Design an enzyme around this catalytic site. Sequence first.
Site, PDB file in Angstrom:
ATOM      1  N   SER A 206     -43.784 -68.319 -21.246  1.00 14.33           N
ATOM      2  CA  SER A 206     -45.108 -68.322 -21.875  1.00 14.33           C
ATOM      3  C   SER A 206     -46.050 -69.369 -21.223  1.00 14.33           C
ATOM      4  O   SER A 206     -46.274 -69.301 -20.011  1.00 14.33           O
ATOM      5  CB  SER A 206     -44.927 -68.326 -23.395  1.00 14.33           C
ATOM      6  OG  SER A 206     -46.025 -67.991 -24.241  1.00 14.33           O
ATOM      7  N   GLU A 331     -44.061 -57.755 -26.446  1.00 15.26           N
ATOM      8  CA  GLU A 331     -44.708 -59.054 -26.295  1.00 15.26           C
ATOM      9  C   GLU A 331     -45.714 -59.352 -27.405  1.00 15.26           C
ATOM     10  O   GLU A 331     -45.836 -60.501 -27.816  1.00 15.26           O
ATOM     11  CB  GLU A 331     -45.394 -59.158 -24.930  1.00 15.26           C
ATOM     12  CG  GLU A 331     -44.427 -59.235 -23.727  1.00 15.26           C
ATOM     13  CD  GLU A 331     -43.687 -60.573 -23.599  1.00 15.26           C
ATOM     14  OE1 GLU A 331     -43.989 -61.519 -24.361  1.00 15.26           O
ATOM     15  OE2 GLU A 331     -42.792 -60.669 -22.727  1.00 15.26           O
ATOM     16  N   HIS A 444     -41.819 -61.603 -28.372  1.00 12.48           N
ATOM     17  CA  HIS A 444     -42.129 -62.731 -27.507  1.00 12.48           C
ATOM     18  C   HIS A 444     -41.261 -63.965 -27.827  1.00 12.48           C
ATOM     19  O   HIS A 444     -41.188 -64.409 -28.980  1.00 12.48           O
ATOM     20  CB  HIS A 444     -43.610 -63.054 -27.665  1.00 12.48           C
ATOM     21  CG  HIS A 444     -44.097 -64.165 -26.803  1.00 12.48           C
ATOM     22  ND1 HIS A 444     -44.437 -63.983 -25.483  1.00 12.48           N
ATOM     23  CD2 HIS A 444     -44.338 -65.470 -27.085  1.00 12.48           C
ATOM     24  CE1 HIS A 444     -44.853 -65.135 -24.978  1.00 12.48           C
ATOM     25  NE2 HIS A 444     -44.800 -66.051 -25.929  1.00 12.48           N
TER      26      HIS A 444
END
Lengths: 537, 532
Positions: A206, A331, A444
Amino acid sequence: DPMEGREDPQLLVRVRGGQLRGIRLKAPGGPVSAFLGIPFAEPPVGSRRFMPPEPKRPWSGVLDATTFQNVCYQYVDTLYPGFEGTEMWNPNRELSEDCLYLNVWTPYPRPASPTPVLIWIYGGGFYSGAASLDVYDGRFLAQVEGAVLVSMNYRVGTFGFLALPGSREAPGNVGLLDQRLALQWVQENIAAFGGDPMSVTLFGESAGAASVGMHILSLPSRSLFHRAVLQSGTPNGPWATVSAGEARRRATLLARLVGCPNDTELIACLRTRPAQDLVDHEWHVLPQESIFRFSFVPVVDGDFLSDTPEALINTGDFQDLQVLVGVVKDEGSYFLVYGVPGFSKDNESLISRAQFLAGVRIGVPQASDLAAEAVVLHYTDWLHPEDPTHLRDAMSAVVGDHNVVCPVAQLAGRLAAQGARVYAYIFEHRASTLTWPLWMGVPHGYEIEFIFGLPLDPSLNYTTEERIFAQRLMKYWTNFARTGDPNDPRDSKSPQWPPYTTAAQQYVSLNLKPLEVRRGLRAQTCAFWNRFLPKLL
Amino acid sequence: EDPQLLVRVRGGQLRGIRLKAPGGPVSAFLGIPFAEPPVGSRRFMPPEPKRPWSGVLDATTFQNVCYQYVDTLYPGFEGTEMWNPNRELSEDCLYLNVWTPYPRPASPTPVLIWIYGGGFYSGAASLDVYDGRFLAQVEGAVLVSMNYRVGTFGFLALPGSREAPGNVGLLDQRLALQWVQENIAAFGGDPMSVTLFGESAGAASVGMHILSLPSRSLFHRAVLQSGTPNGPWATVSAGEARRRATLLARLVGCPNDTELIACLRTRPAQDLVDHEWHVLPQESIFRFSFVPVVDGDFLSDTPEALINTGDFQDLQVLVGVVKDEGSYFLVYGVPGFSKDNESLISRAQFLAGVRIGVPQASDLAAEAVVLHYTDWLHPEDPTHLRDAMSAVVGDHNVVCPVAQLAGRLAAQGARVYAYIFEHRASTLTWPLWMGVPHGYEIEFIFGLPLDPSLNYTTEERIFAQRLMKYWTNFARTGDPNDPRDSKSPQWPPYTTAAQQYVSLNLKPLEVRRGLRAQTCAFWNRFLPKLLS
Ligand SMILES: Clc1ccc(OCCCCCn2ccnc2)c(Cl)c1
Ligand SMILES: Clc1ccc(OCCCCCn2ccnc2)c(Cl)c1
Ligand SMILES: Clc1ccc(OCCCCCn2ccnc2)c(Cl)c1
């Protein structure tokens, strides 16, 4: 250290700044060495807030290096009191501005000959995160693959990325400079641990993957590592950077908000505000429809980032590079419960079509009226353009595609066209222990625990297939770090993971099933996002 | 002399000719005048009803093809010559033909009227693929087809003028429709069960009869094959039709409205035909000069406006397309295409070709068509670009207009059935890469594979009989399904909810959903907002 002669001789190590004593940790298959809370910088406090990191000044005596140090000052999530889904990402040590420490895991005893180093840069949207979270535990990669694993704390939020560009007192990107300082530290000192400083692989997730990506694009950092892994994050894309102008705008506004009326006078005032006042207002400097942007992120300063990441990855020479990049399946789901009305972790979040149109405005806050309708039309199912389940899921994928999957796709494609060796994956296994609702799929962040080996801890109630799976992934990652090829050469039984090239666009799926090769990384949809949509945007 | 072949219509006696179909005889009545010849001062004017006649009018023979352009791209080639005139050209052409079972039907039979296409610039009711003997023999139908004026003769308009008001070609069709009302009963046809059906320009015409009120009381059901009243090509504006007529005038030497038309009436027909097309910016090669005009009269508004606001509650419609509508148009207009090689084009060609297929389009909209139609796994594969080019032209000009019309008519009251035709004719003389091209459904609908001397496969003989059953079941009932059936799968009505349609091929009916739903959402919903 008058007690040395009776302490464990295999846990004493000297680095440039002095002596450290680590700790023998139990991992499921044997012991590992852990050195935790090594200062690599002078505490960036008082007059040093917003300033670049200064290298740690040598200490006398044996530094206790057996426990994690402070977490960098940051917002703490409280949307869901006592919920494992959010608490696993929350700070697990005291918050403090004095937080520039790093950690080293190695086998026990330390390796005889130089061993490839993995350096972990954590995510957290540049507003949060810590190298001490259970999910980033280096003990399994150390014990099982024999890896030397380093993870550092870096300043986040205002403290790390508030910039008044061009000033000397708050130049910006200092959080990236914290990371670099740790990288340098690894260069001078990792040999003292059995680490090979000529084989250093960065990896992150990320904002962390974004950070890794940025070190690729910043030349002073390019001599500090050899290979990179970007998980669910890129230096390009809508959220990971801002312009000098925009960063200047946001610092000024935050200054007004906390009562601070010439750049020097402004920053001097900010430096007097308590840490929590900055945290309390850092969010309030955006239109709070920009719930999907953070305010203080790396700035395109012409210094660390010589130009925009999209410019540097469009014109860069990458023959040097080997990179492993990839995404999880869903995601976007995670974020919906925080920004789009109609969404919850507690119900099935079936939404209306109006809620969808509204969610696309929040998901693409930069968009015009035309661009939004273009996104809306592209993600509609015209056979059932009112079906609430198809609309929930489409909302998920709009946020996920725009912010992660298509930035990754763009980076993969550009790096491959410009010489780099690229390996692409999609991670499709939902953790058996996951406490987010089923509708969120593989959210995610939830591949990280599999890369780090946590399923090997029997105490954690993973399945036995998940133990096997985590071992396959650990081998992929450490193989890549060792050789720049995730494949095991001593093994042609197993299916090969082919490089990602602009002609065949191959990528693999990571799940409990054997490797499967696919073509086109969400190719049609990202052509929309990366090629067409940037007009009406 | 045969009494079955001597009919008396309202204007005099006719003598037909008993023809041979594979399963037996049919009575044919070819070359029946339904209008005063539109020559001399009648050129460009509405048709007037035929004056009555003495004695017995010989109606045994096809009359003349309406004066039209003749195609020359591939001289002698069966593929193209099959659409070319098969009688001599003349402005004296307002005749219709009638097919009937032999002997003339016992009880009033459902009537199907055929309106040919050919782009409002060509076409004849006498082509072999429009042969009505098979539908008449096998299904007992009464089948009618008229010639209507095409090109400048049918559609050159000076909007507002009295001597070239526009749409006379459609008025030709309307007159034949009144003729069938006043006369078809004498042939055993039922004036109260009249079904229009047509292809391409003919399908458009059929649609414009739906959308024009004087026409509405002359038929009860309609069938639109690969063409639409809505769309980019079937209509022009009053202002644009004027611009085009005036530029045609100056190109032939002419010169006030009355003055200008008078000078045009003096010009030999082939002079007009010669300058017919040089009249629009030649990016408009997939676009014809003289087509139905939005006149405020025959069409009270644009077809779009009328299909968006109309009440179609008492109307049944059968609409459809073929699998590769855009093939035929490529070899004529897009550089890189030919009937003789496999037309494997470059990406540069595809980009240029898109400018042709969407001549109206801003830079941004072309870029949007290019990006939507690219296959990003193989963005440079010639086979993929060739196939896409064909899909761009087909989807923009036929498939998505059909999807839009189907959906509007359904939403506003009409019973709709939709198909996509997917059998390629074993006898087809076009290359394999063109798939199932525009127009090559017609011969199966008309039952040409039943003629053994045409060398169609036995399965095609069975296929063709199926389609003839759908079309005549639809004519009879408003429903293509069989009222005591073959217990095959049922063909569901098309609705704006389930969007169901069938596939017509050698296999049994297959129900699908969404007629190119994603791609046509792009053309009808998004892309307009992009030249705006
Ligand atoms: Cl795709 C995506 C979604 C969310 C997001 O950022 C949320 C920041 C939330 C910050 C909350 N906060 C910080 C301090 N006080 C509240 C970003 Cl950069 C990108
Ligand atoms: Cl110069 C010229 C001639 C023909 C043509 O396009 C043929 C359309 C199809 C003509 C045959 N057809 C099929 C169905 N009805 C008539 C074009 Cl773009 C240009
Ligand atoms: Cl999708 C499509 C393709 C072709 C076309 O129109 C072709 C006219 C060809 C006219 C040829 N011609 C006639 C007289 N002189 C030239 C139209 Cl309206 C629509």
